[PDB]
């Protein structure tokens, strides 16, 4: 398997790991802060997904310093992972077009 496909797969697995770890850590960081809502694991996982995809509905979000640092890691991991898939798709099209041109 070519590099871009392997890297894409790896990025997906790493993203799932970041989502799970981020969910666990977000609850750890937010409980103890009066008013915080990102405090149970099921909704924290949902929050991690809508954060990684950059949707950000606003139904849930961190209010503490550490919860926000966790959020930044989730954001960057999501953007980087989806960006890498785009890059892999571009490489695929580039390779195919070269062929179609006889190269």
């Amino acid at each position, epitope marked *: 398997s070519a590099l871009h496909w392997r890297a894409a797969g790896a990025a997906t697995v790493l993203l799932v790991i970041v989502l799970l770890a981020g969910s666990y850590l977000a609850v*750890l960081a937010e*409980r*103890g802060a*009066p*008013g*915080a809502q990102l*405090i*149970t694991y099921p909704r924290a996982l949902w929050w991690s997904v809508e954060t990684a995809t950059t949707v950000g509905y606003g139904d849930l979000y961190p209010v503490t310093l550490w919860g926000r640092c966790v959020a930044v890691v989730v954001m960057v991991a999501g953007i980087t992972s989806f960006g890498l898939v785009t890059a892999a798709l571009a490489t695929w099209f580039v390779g195919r077009e070269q062929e179609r041109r006889g190269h």
Partner: antibody
Amino acid sequence: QVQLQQPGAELVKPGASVKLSCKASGYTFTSDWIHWVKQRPGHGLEWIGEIIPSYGRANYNEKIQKKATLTADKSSSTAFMQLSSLTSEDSAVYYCARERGDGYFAVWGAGTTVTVSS
Amino acid sequence: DILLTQSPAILSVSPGERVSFSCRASQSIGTDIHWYQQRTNGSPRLLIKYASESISGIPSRFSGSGSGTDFTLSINSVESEDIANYYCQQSNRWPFTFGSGTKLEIKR
């Protein structure tokens, strides 16, 4: 089988401290939190604090004077609540309860009756 | 912190009659409300979770409803064993808080 085991009672002289225990059995997850609740005779339930054994962090009710310090021993699956410098105001039943990180207390211990008297 | 108001503090019903306990939150908490039963000298016992979800082992007689700020715990056809104190508890925001409790009294 009993998921949370707590000693029946503890007599404490005013000013002294005591360490309550809560031995847990059954399924255990990294997402479990052990809570402590205080209930004076004839009164309601008051949340004291919580601790996550897998990490060891504890949080406390800010609305009340802090009398407790929570710890947990992973190898013995036991959670502890150290109550210090007690007065008769601290006399009550202290329950421990388990929450699977999803907001509700799935199960409660039988409670430890603490009496502060000379 | 979220204040949970349970009023009336005492509810008197006749045998076999349907009863409803009230729980009002100081602010909207979605369906993050749970109900517990505590008999004399007993420890609290979970009856309903997330406002209306059944717990295995609890009689079908028990049900819950509501969302937002107003919640209800209902018992269809009350019987002696239901005599106890009932508490609501929220988990929408930190810290978790408890309502002050409602006692069920039966007029036989």
